[PDB]
Amino acid sequence: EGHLIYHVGDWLQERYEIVSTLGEGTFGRVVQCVDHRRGGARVALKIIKNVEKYKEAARLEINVLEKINEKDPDNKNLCVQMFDWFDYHGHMCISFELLGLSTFDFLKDNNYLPYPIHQVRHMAFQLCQAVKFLHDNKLTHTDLKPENILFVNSDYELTYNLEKKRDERSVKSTAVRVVDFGSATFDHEHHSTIVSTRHYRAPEVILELGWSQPCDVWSIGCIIFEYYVGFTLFQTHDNREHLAMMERILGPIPSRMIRKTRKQKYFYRGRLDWDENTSAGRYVRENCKPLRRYLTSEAEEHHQLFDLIESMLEYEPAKRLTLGEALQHPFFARLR
């Protein structure tokens, strides 16, 4: 498949002693290494497949990662640090700071039982800070999701949930980092027509009306919801169904966006061409509901969170909350 074959103990660059495999994917593999040129510091080495397209994609990430480091010498940006990069016999290798499991991995290991609201607040704040940094530097991440947000340390402690009568895993530290900048696009760069993983895709991306920074905010909205409930907001792999789910959860699509889109097969009489009476329409009715019906409590802090999610899930990209605004939200008031 083009993967680099390696054994526990191998030395790349005569520098990186392989300890274990941290991750795996279609990009390649991530390996924990002892960096003998950095005092024996444990690093995370992303080894990209020996494949033309993935190599060219890795170089674009390296370009973003170099801009990330440049514009953040003190490492306050909450984006993953690249310490080194090199070309190893066709394999692009990137040396990262060692982190923990993804916020998805942790949620999954916790039976998809949601994060506590106080942890959601700290996770959401850091997410907004990290992407705002990118937004300030003329960048859009495009591929934001629980998998691309990692805990710095994913060590947990067992905590009883008196309500659900179950034991829950609670991460000791909620410090997170944003990873995977392979899709990151500069303002001047060639924008792809379709971006984001399905579940976190903004409606302007679906309707192909052009996209920039606002589409990241839409993703962050979905992610934060997922942190609060446990399951993904839009569970679908179909455009027309996705748009129907959007309408049920958030209300009608703005008339201007229907008017402007070329995706006119999805629309009839200036409204969404969706029949709720079908078995597909009934499925949408029984698998999702208006956004605020997902509240686990009526306490003020829970309502403030959904004020934030709702503002982030504004249909119109230009009318959508910016991340500079997001950090000023009443929901983040009780943080140091």
Ligand SMILES: CCN1/C(=C/C(C)=O)Sc2ccc(OC)cc21
């Ligand atoms: C496998 C997750 N992962 C990355 C993934 C991608 C696609 O970039 S980048 C990364 C860096 C450190 C780490 O520590 C454990 C993990 C890590």
